[PDB]
Amino acid sequence: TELQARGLTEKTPDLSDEDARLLTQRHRVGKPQFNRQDHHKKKRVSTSWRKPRGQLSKQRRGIKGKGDTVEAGFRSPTAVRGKHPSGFEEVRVHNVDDLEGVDGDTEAVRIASKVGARKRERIEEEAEDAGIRVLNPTYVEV
Amino acid sequence: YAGLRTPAESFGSGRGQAHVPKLDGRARRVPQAVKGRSAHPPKTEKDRS
Amino acid sequence: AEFDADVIVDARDCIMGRVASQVAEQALDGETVAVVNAERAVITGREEQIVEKYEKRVDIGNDNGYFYPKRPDGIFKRTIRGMLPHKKQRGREAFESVRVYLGNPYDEDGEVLDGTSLDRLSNIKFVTLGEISETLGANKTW
Amino acid sequence: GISYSVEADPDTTAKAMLRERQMSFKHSKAIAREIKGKTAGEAVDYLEAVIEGDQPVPFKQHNSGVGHKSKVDGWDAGRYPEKASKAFLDLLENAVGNADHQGFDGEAMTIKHVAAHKVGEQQGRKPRAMGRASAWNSPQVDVELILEEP
RNA sequence: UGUCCCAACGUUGGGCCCGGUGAACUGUACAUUCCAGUGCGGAGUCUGGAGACACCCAGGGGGAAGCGAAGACCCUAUGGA
RNA sequence: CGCUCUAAUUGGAUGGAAGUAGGGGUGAAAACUCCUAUGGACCGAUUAGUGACGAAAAUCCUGGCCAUAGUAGCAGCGAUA
RNA sequence: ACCCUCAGAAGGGAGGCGAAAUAGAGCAUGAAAUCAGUUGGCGAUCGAGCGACAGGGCAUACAAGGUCCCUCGACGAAUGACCGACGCGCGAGCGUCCAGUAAGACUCACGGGAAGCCGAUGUUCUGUCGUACGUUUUGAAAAACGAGCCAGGGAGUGUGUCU
């Protein structure tokens, strides 16, 4: 009579103390948008980042207010870089056999969008039985 | 000779237009022009072995 | 038309600019101030050069306009405005919670703010807002 | 062509459309705007008065150069687009007709929705001095109308 | 002899309002400005003040170093005729 | 990082592929990925290659489109109808 | 097809076919510019590179994010007190002790709380900074040059020889 997601939906991974600390930091510190300069001034200029190259570029010369320019110093902590916000490391899955070798305590699985419902049903039940959480689960009316 | 079969000429300065070769009021020949030549296309003389 | 002023200042024999500065400070702190006896407020220096300055402000102008007040009423109110960011919300709010009066329309007497008093027994080179207004051609309604 | 841009319950609603009408699209937005919410019958009486010259149509957007009209309320510029008004009378005639054929009291139904859409221009050309010709086109207008029981 | 002193009144067609028809020039963006100053020394946009409720109609064109034309002048090019 | 096609290895799709629209997640970033709607048949990954491989600009080119604007014109000619 | 409407083989309405008519004729998909209608936010006393970063308002179906807030406690870098006591200075004020103590960003635990609630997204308000971009140039916001807007198109390629 209501919708419910399949699998270990509420599952959390186990992180060392230093990993939970860095995960929490990444989430607290964040980062600037890093959109292309003046993308908001012209519709033909998209948001996708491009190094400002103008000799007189205000962002290039680094004027406060013109937005931050991409630098390595903005990188996230090595130990947590790329983790889902839950803390899991993501594993791309295209079929049941892709579930093999996956540690459900440290990794969560993400079924490619291109995978059909028939095959998603199998992957989802095999993942739950292997103790693996599926990030993009199917909702059934139970 | 693709894109080159035209006597298209540029009007130069004077009519408020960019110096682009035109024919029958249509821009032609140059690479930036639709129906113009290919600037650096695949070449038959190339040694592909 | 009734003005619940938290503070009633008596400008009589008080240095206009010094009072203005404190009234602005208090208005920005959220106080509703009513300056009383404006026509008796005082300004130091050679009456002749003081008046030359205010007369110039009266003569300045053009189509856009430079409407300068002539009554002690407005002279003082303007003096205060020049010490408030009257074009910003917080500034306009402060400015609008301040009013100046000719004589004293209240029953209570105003208080004399520290540092703003002028001792007539020790000064001869000073002028009165009322005297300035009369010179400017104002109608001595006070 | 357009499709009804708003949902409509067939059990308490009647529809109608104009297609590719060659008339002022600007006059159409103005008229639609003015008759929305009125009752079919009111709309008709209103448009007959416009065509007769007794009631102006407020021109609130496409008003450059338009002279003021005392009878325009809450605004200043107005005019009497009788051509686009007659097209709307046809639209209303069709709507009310459909309404009745279904068992509704056509004239009494409310204009729940009415909007004009520019579907194109009939292209024309006009010879000008110095050897050139310039555009001289006709707007093509579609307009949708949904009547709804009170 | 209205060229002028020194302008007036009138006529016809426009102009203005209404129906219908219905373009073009131009457009980096923002834009209610004014006075000063500053700045590549000729600013609606920077700074300081002043002024400024929104919209619309008619107008004569002060400004946008207005729009139109990759300056016909001047010089330069191991250019052309 | 991304784009095209080739090869080897290996996967996805009518139990709904590419694309598009809106939205969630990741990456300093190029960009990657998922969800929903639309769509209705194709689509990847890794490795080694291939190259008509990346645009904000050139009074750039072609197509489409807005403001201009319900604006100018639809008066002027010795033929005022 | 039939029916209603209409001056009407137009168009419209209803209806029939098909998995789909939002496949009904330049009839697969259907971006942007842009237009109509409408929803959210702002709005007729107020100021202009349109934003970046902070922080407030209001708005939010699900899914793909799940955090956030307050008492208290633990940890506690640089820095770092009040009060009190004593002692100096014409004075503003200072020294010594209390004391490198109380405090101190982040993080964590207990207890309580929020689900438009935290993130995020839209818009708007406040604070700080801020006169596009690319080019020319010693010097560009420039009263120097370019573009109306969007989509698509648009520039180190081949042979031979040398290094």
Ligand SMILES: [Cl-]
């Ligand atoms: Cl790196």
Ligand SMILES: [Cl-]
């Ligand atoms: Cl004035």
Ligand SMILES: [Cl-]
């Ligand atoms: Cl201010």
Ligand SMILES: [Cl-]
């Ligand atoms: Cl004295």
Ligand SMILES: [Cl-]
């Ligand atoms: Cl139009």
Ligand SMILES: [Cl-]
């Ligand atoms: Cl920490």
Ligand SMILES: [Cl-]
């Ligand atoms: Cl190169």
Ligand SMILES: [Mg+2]
């Ligand atoms: Mg943009």
Ligand SMILES: [Mg+2]
């Ligand atoms: Mg070609």
Ligand SMILES: [Mg+2]
């Ligand atoms: Mg007019």
Ligand SMILES: [Mg+2]
């Ligand atoms: Mg001719």
Ligand SMILES: [Mg+2]
């Ligand atoms: Mg030249």
Ligand SMILES: [Mg+2]
């Ligand atoms: Mg010469």
Ligand SMILES: [Mg+2]
């Ligand atoms: Mg010669």
Ligand SMILES: [Mg+2]
């Ligand atoms: Mg492989």
Ligand SMILES: [Mg+2]
């Ligand atoms: Mg391209």
